[PDB]
Amino acid sequence: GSMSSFLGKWKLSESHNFDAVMSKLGVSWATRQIGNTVTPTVTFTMDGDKMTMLTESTFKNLSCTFKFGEEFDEKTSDGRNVKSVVEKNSESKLTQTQVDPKNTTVIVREVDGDTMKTTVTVGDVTAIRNYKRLS
Numbered sequence: 001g002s003m004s005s006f007l008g009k010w011k012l013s014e015s016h017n018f019d020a021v022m023s024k025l026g027v028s029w030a031t032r033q034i035g036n037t038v039t040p041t042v043t044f045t046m047d048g049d050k051m052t053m054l055t056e057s058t059f060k061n062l063s064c065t066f067k068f069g070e071e072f073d074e075k076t077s078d079g080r081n082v083k084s085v086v087e088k089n090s091e092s093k094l095t096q097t098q099v100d101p102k103n104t105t106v107i108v109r110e111v112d113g114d115t116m117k118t119t120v121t122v123g124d125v126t127a128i129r130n131y132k133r134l135s
């Protein structure tokens, strides 16, 4: 219920054009390289009206918890302090916009069966990241 398809765990399987989006984010060379190697595992759980998305890689394990529509501060993996809002588009889709003062990153995550497609957009640049559902 409310993001039922999002519940559970997810491992990255493919990433296309990701160095473009986060060169544009000014992510350092070194953190970008790690971004291009590691395959995070994100977990969602819905807990009442608050959803939590945990990301686990060898780099960092970050997690954050949000109401939909409700702005909230966040530290990104790379280290930018951003103001985020996650909107519910549908039951199989949500959209996390991330505002720092240099750029705004929009992150569409969309569940379709065993795939969650994560589209990441900074201005005119776009990367797509697919996660295969675990178990």
Ligand SMILES: CCCCC/C=C\C/C=C\C/C=C\C/C=C\CCCC(=O)O
Pocket (backbone or CB within 6 Å): 021, 022, 025, 027, 031, 032, 034, 035, 036, 038, 040, 042, 055, 056, 057, 059, 060, 061, 062, 076, 077, 078, 105, 107, 118, 120, 129
């Ligand atoms: C612990 C984080 C692991 C991710 C890779 C590590 C570093 C990459 C560096 C910067 C990434 C910065 C911005 C990209 C914005 C959103 C990506 C999350 C999409 C997803 O949910 O796939």
